[PDB]
Write a protein that holds these residues in place. Sequence first.
Motif, PDB file in Angstrom:
ATOM      1  N   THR A  70      34.790  49.254  34.722  1.00  0.00           N
ATOM      2  CA  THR A  70      34.547  49.076  36.076  1.00  0.00           C
ATOM      3  C   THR A  70      33.146  49.207  36.266  1.00  0.00           C
ATOM      4  OG1 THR A  70      35.568  51.120  36.339  1.00  0.00           O
ATOM      5  CG2 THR A  70      36.903  49.048  36.785  1.00  0.00           C
ATOM      6  N   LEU A  71      32.473  50.244  35.918  1.00  0.00           N
ATOM      7  CA  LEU A  71      31.279  50.866  36.296  1.00  0.00           C
ATOM      8  C   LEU A  71      30.136  49.943  35.570  1.00  0.00           C
ATOM      9  CD1 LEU A  71      29.808  54.519  35.949  1.00  0.00           C
ATOM     10  CD2 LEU A  71      28.659  52.582  35.174  1.00  0.00           C
ATOM     11  N   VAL A  72      30.452  49.472  34.386  1.00  0.00           N
ATOM     12  CA  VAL A  72      29.658  48.662  33.500  1.00  0.00           C
ATOM     13  C   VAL A  72      29.648  47.095  34.294  1.00  0.00           C
ATOM     14  CG1 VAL A  72      29.325  47.174  31.687  1.00  0.00           C
ATOM     15  CG2 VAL A  72      29.587  49.606  31.375  1.00  0.00           C
ATOM     16  N   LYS A  73      30.543  46.659  34.617  1.00  0.00           N
ATOM     17  CA  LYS A  73      30.646  45.548  35.290  1.00  0.00           C
ATOM     18  C   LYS A  73      30.137  45.420  36.830  1.00  0.00           C
ATOM     19  CE  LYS A  73      34.598  43.943  34.292  1.00  0.00           C
ATOM     20  NZ  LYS A  73      33.968  43.731  32.991  1.00  0.00           N
ATOM     21  N   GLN A  74      30.284  46.727  37.435  1.00  0.00           N
ATOM     22  CA  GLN A  74      29.685  46.692  38.963  1.00  0.00           C
ATOM     23  C   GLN A  74      28.317  46.255  38.875  1.00  0.00           C
ATOM     24  OE1 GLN A  74      31.899  47.441  40.981  1.00  0.00           O
ATOM     25  NE2 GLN A  74      31.199  48.707  42.813  1.00  0.00           N
ATOM     26  N   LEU A  75      27.379  46.538  37.893  1.00  0.00           N
ATOM     27  CA  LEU A  75      25.953  45.972  38.221  1.00  0.00           C
ATOM     28  C   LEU A  75      25.888  44.613  38.230  1.00  0.00           C
ATOM     29  CD1 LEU A  75      24.761  44.884  35.225  1.00  0.00           C
ATOM     30  CD2 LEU A  75      24.926  47.568  34.989  1.00  0.00           C
ATOM     31  N   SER A  76      26.738  43.687  37.953  1.00  0.00           N
ATOM     32  CA  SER A  76      26.782  42.370  37.876  1.00  0.00           C
ATOM     33  C   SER A  76      26.798  41.832  39.417  1.00  0.00           C
ATOM     34  CB  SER A  76      27.856  41.644  37.195  1.00  0.00           C
ATOM     35  OG  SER A  76      27.365  41.492  35.669  1.00  0.00           O
ATOM     36  N   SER A  77      27.267  42.957  40.299  1.00  0.00           N
ATOM     37  CA  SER A  77      27.555  42.278  41.704  1.00  0.00           C
ATOM     38  C   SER A  77      26.153  42.517  42.349  1.00  0.00           C
ATOM     39  CB  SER A  77      28.440  43.515  42.550  1.00  0.00           C
ATOM     40  OG  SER A  77      28.269  43.220  43.709  1.00  0.00           O
TER      41      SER A  77
ATOM     42  N   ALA B  90      29.197  43.115  28.784  1.00  0.00           N
ATOM     43  CA  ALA B  90      28.757  43.745  29.846  1.00  0.00           C
ATOM     44  C   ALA B  90      27.951  42.607  30.803  1.00  0.00           C
ATOM     45  CB  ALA B  90      27.622  44.761  29.445  1.00  0.00           C
ATOM     46  N   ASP B  91      28.154  41.525  30.658  1.00  0.00           N
ATOM     47  CA  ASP B  91      27.605  40.416  31.378  1.00  0.00           C
ATOM     48  C   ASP B  91      26.284  40.398  31.488  1.00  0.00           C
ATOM     49  OD1 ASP B  91      30.380  39.691  31.131  1.00  0.00           O
ATOM     50  OD2 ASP B  91      30.594  40.550  33.151  1.00  0.00           O
TER      51      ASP B  91
ATOM     52  N   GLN C 125      31.499  39.037  47.627  1.00  0.00           N
ATOM     53  CA  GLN C 125      30.483  39.196  46.832  1.00  0.00           C
ATOM     54  C   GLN C 125      30.021  40.551  46.492  1.00  0.00           C
ATOM     55  OE1 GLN C 125      26.909  40.054  47.675  1.00  0.00           O
ATOM     56  NE2 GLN C 125      27.429  40.482  49.747  1.00  0.00           N
ATOM     57  N   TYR C 126      30.849  41.434  47.129  1.00  0.00           N
ATOM     58  CA  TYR C 126      30.492  42.923  46.821  1.00  0.00           C
ATOM     59  C   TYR C 126      31.081  43.228  45.421  1.00  0.00           C
ATOM     60  CZ  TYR C 126      28.169  44.236  51.015  1.00  0.00           C
ATOM     61  OH  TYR C 126      27.342  44.286  51.974  1.00  0.00           O
ATOM     62  N   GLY C 127      32.285  42.818  45.102  1.00  0.00           N
ATOM     63  CA  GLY C 127      32.699  42.896  43.963  1.00  0.00           C
ATOM     64  C   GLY C 127      34.211  43.534  43.928  1.00  0.00           C
TER      65      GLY C 127
ATOM     66  N   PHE D 255      25.305  42.931  45.562  1.00  0.00           N
ATOM     67  CA  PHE D 255      25.582  44.042  46.733  1.00  0.00           C
ATOM     68  C   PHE D 255      24.569  43.135  48.033  1.00  0.00           C
ATOM     69  CE2 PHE D 255      26.646  48.220  44.985  1.00  0.00           C
ATOM     70  CZ  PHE D 255      27.067  47.705  43.827  1.00  0.00           C
ATOM     71  N   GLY D 256      25.109  42.031  48.116  1.00  0.00           N
ATOM     72  CA  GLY D 256      24.395  41.242  49.316  1.00  0.00           C
ATOM     73  C   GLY D 256      22.820  40.979  49.221  1.00  0.00           C
TER      74      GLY D 256
END
Lengths: 48, 49, 35, 49
Positions: free
Chosen positions: A29-36, B29-30, D19-21, A38-39
């Motif tokens: 989850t932490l790794v995939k988060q940076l793909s967001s 990791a995309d 789009q936030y995740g 964040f507006g």
Amino acid sequence: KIQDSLSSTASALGKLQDVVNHNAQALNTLVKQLSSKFGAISSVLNDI
Amino acid sequence: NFNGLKGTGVLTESNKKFLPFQQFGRDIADTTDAVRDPQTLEILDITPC
Amino acid sequence: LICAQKFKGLTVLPPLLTDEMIAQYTSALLAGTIT
Amino acid sequence: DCTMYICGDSTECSNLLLQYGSFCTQLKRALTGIAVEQDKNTQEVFAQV
């Protein structure tokens, strides 16, 4: 007879499988988060 | 920098297989990890430092 | 190879005690409690 | 609920929130863990016989 109980079923060792599964889920989850994005304009840093 | 792929990293030969229409490379990791040079046909792997 | 793909700033340090050392502790306890 | 609480019965806000995740995903995961642990508590305490 103890040995067969462990060897046969697959739910005996859940109490330790859960820990490593939770850690793997948290890391993923932490790794995939940076793909967001964040507006923001774009997730990738350089294009900004 | 490949046609709009800004970044850095140590570039090496990419022995992985790409479909004829596929040029980008992505990971679990995309993030971009492999490309194909447009000038010369060989595939490049952008490994990190 | 997810562990190898976690290179993006994430590390997994090894434990101080290795498996052989833990097995040696366990063997010591077992040899103590039965003699 | 993921979206009903934040900006329920809205369209463009619903579009702009996704789009936030995977935030509300881990929210729901944590709450489900809480609930199953709550049931497990009474199961442990009272089912000794």
